[PDB]
Amino acid sequence: VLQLTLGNSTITTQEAANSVVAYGRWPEYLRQPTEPDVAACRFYTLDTVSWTKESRGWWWKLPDALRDMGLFGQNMYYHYLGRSGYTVHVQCNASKFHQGALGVFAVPEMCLAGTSYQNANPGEKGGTFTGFCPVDYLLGNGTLLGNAFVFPHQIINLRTNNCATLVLPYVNSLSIDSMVKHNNWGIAILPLAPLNFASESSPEIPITLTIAPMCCEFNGLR
Amino acid sequence: VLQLTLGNSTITTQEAANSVVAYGRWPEYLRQPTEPDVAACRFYTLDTVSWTKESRGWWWKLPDALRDMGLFGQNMYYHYLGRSGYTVHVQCNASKFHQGALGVFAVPEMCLAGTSYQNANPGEKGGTFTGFCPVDYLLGNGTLLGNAFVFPHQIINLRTNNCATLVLPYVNSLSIDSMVKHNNWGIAILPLAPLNFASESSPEIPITLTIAPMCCEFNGLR
């Protein structure tokens, strides 16, 4: 049990073994803007989601998720430009008698499709796929989902590991950019193997996202 | 699995990690009497007690518990004065699906109250608290039970550890004393969190006390 800390936040990880760095590049500051690594770099734990049998998937955009989230959300409104890597812990705590799997896919430029800002930007609650709501096995764009495993990703197979970790570097055409407008990353959690459980066990296991913005740096503060 | 031995007795401990020494003083001989450490210093395992949902607590006095217990009980009648430390293993073996907690409190001079010798001295069977029978959350004397955790104590929380160990030194105003009259120590086991279990599991888990009198020494034999 590894107990991680970032300032006024603390997390209880099993242990950071099955941790995927996206594209083998650790988040780095730009090799010019300010770096509020003081307290904006902490664990923001979103509101948990319930994975029932019927669930098709969930998705969040980054940093649109962390838009109402305290200092990062503040920084990201009162500055004009910013860039941030992330550490997404997807913990999915279930008993030994639940079974299933989750594909956790970090997606660069995750343009979804069933269009408008409020619609493409659900914030902290996230959105959900469906068989608007994009198609689950497409991620909106008419994709075959198996191919999705090109994306930086990790499986949460309940028999084995019950949590994934994705370390995302800043991916963008530009060196820095407006965060209020343009979501670099996109997280989609789809249940590969559906949930099932023993007769009168907990019929909906929870899933929790913990997002530490790594190496964030912003410019210019209004 | 640590298999402990004392002469003609043997015990199967999980391992002696969560072992509380009362008041940080290990039992010692007096720094003048005889020391029957030959065979009186062995494991005396009392008659198990069944912890149902409705149980409020149990208690034993020491050495009144070990009064009919073989050589120690003999020594402690035919000598006039004695002193003895103890090692109380409270093993409480339950499945992974039972839940609850036990506070095991070693109490110096555990004068209980609802008065007479046979009444204040239950022997090997012990007594039981009740909501005579003393009040559970008082230990007879009008105490708030949380405060009880000043006493040398240990929790047996069924999710984690299922057994406690208390190493008690000889606590008394005197250097040596009559054991037939005056019980130095007192053990009270109260269920902090009540027992509960899955639907058709074992509805009453057992609790077993194993009492090794350490560093006993007596005077004068009639």
Next chain:
Amino acid sequence: VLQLTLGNSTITTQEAANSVVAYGRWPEYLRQPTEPDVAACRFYTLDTVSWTKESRGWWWKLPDALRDMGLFGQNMYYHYLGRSGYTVHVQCNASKFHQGALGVFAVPEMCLAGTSYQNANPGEKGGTFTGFCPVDYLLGNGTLLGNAFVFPHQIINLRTNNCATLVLPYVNSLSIDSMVKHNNWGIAILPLAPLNFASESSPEIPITLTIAPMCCEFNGLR
């Protein structure tokens, strides 16, 4: 012409010659809390006041003045305790043909009197003495005003120097304290010699306060 700077602020001082440090103690950090010297330590220039012939005086409390003032005002609400020294530049820019004088008195614990919070705390606009409104030559408490020159103070005599500077250390019974409740310092500007000017000159010269909170440090952020 000395051009002073603090981050995103800049000031045009004549030159820092006639600069009074109150009680000969420069502001110091406590020899435990955080020190937001990043951007809260800047020049906050209050809304200018017009000194006509009929003016009797003005006053501000510190840090109640800087309560709606950006980061310092933020820090000073979301933290529970704080302490701050100050640098008060009172610039009073008039022509060569206006005449008069101003006594600028930094006052520890400037309890005024003609009582309630909103009344004793004017904020950024400040209050004004009168011949509620306290008595000018008393500073509310029944004082003879000449004696006021015991306070850390400076004269702005328009013939000579047209600006004062007061460097105030943190004065309080406590090492740190709640700023939302209790105003350590108090600034009172009273016209010693009344304004007068040549026939058709500017009939009301302005007075401007610039307050740099020095060595501020706060605890604990909610």
Next chain:
Amino acid sequence: HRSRSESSIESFFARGACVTIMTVDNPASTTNKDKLFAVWKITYKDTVQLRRKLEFFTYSRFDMELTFVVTANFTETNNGHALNQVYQIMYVPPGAPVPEKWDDYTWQTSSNPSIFYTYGTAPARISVPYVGISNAYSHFYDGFSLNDFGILAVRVVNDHNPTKVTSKIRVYLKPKHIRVWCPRPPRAVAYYG
């Protein structure tokens, strides 16, 4: 500067000064009201000399060497005789509960130090130290929710007395080891009464 000592802060403040006259009665069973005991919260804000001197300055620390001068007298001409009385002079520290009856629980409480002064002996005396929660007594405090020095309670310990005996206790506060901070314009003698 010929030995400026006499105007040093110690020489200035540290002087015996009567701060109150506390009157108590003998527990006669006739019609004695709740004057059986006297209570007084230690405060300079009633005596003008010490107040005016302290209010030269903003903050201060000082020990406090209270001295008690008890003087009694028979009330009516039924004097006859009456045995030498004893007075309990309890110093209730700050934040502690003050007595309410002659024989409240507070008088026996271990916390509250107490003198048992016999009449016709040398004046009693304690030395309260600095009892401030702050690091200095604030005489002026611009802020929102005065400082506590304590209470002095005084009673006659004797019980079944046939003759009434009034008694006044002069408290002579002498602030000791004074330090002060941040001088101020002295308030005028005018506005204290």
Next chain:
Amino acid sequence: HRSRSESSIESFFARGACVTIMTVDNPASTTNKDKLFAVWKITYKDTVQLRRKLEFFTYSRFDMELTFVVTANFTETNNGHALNQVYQIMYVPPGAPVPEKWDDYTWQTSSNPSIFYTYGTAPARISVPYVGISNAYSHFYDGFSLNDFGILAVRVVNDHNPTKVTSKIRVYLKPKHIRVWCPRPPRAVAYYG
């Protein structure tokens, strides 16, 4: 841990605390009953503050610095005069026989230490040491056949007095050099009266 002293066991317990008020009478030949002398077995189990403090812990040792505050008064208005009385304050140690009459043999016995306190002087005082048979006072003892500290007896020595003079003696026990052992849940204030 800024000078934790104030909560040290000495600072905690060692405080003057009135444990009893013993009332005696003058040997007037009128109708004076056996109130001519007062007797009191030293025991904390009546005063609640000290009891509750001691019963935090299981065992203890402490010397005992008793102090006596005597205060008298004429009973009836026939005061007139009466000469300064003297009080015999006998401390009967443990296991010794306690007085039964005003002039029992015990009052003259060499063993029993005794104070001869003159009225209107400074309060009397002795320091009983640790008088335990055990190596520590047991406040709770699970066993079969309470500890002894002694008895205090008090009388007026004067004999042929015309006027009655009641007198109360406040005993101010201050336990000194306390050591304690084996903390316990503190009993509640509820069950002491």
Next chain:
Amino acid sequence: KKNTMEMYRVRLSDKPHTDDPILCLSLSPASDPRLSHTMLGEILNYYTHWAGSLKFTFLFCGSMMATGKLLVSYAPPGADPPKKRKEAMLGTHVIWDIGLQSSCTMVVPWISNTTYRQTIDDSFTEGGYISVFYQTRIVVPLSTPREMDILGFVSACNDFSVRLLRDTTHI
């Protein structure tokens, strides 16, 4: 529940999952009636002033199979307590995974303007607010009782100290 065994256990069911916390404990250690009766509170009823830190400990006394997350928040002085999980999370907090660690310690720190604090303040709640929310509703396997209990402990830290004794015990 009071003056029984039940007054120490906080029950965690899987009933309608509301955002209001499992518990919110104000740290006015002598003034708060809950912490008033602990041994800490007992010793603090004997003293006018105190200072220092307080370690709290929450102990899960449920099934070995149960899993979930409790968020243990600490609002500092002046801050009104959190009402929702998000507000609490944004402040200081500890996410506590029942499955992994069965206990959770938290050392509330020392914060005061004065060097000490009175134990009978001006009837003014300040300082602590130790709240505990559900981050995730508790997961249990087969027919395992969905009603668990958690216990809460408290102790002065090493730095803690008191001063100016004040006996008040009386009848």
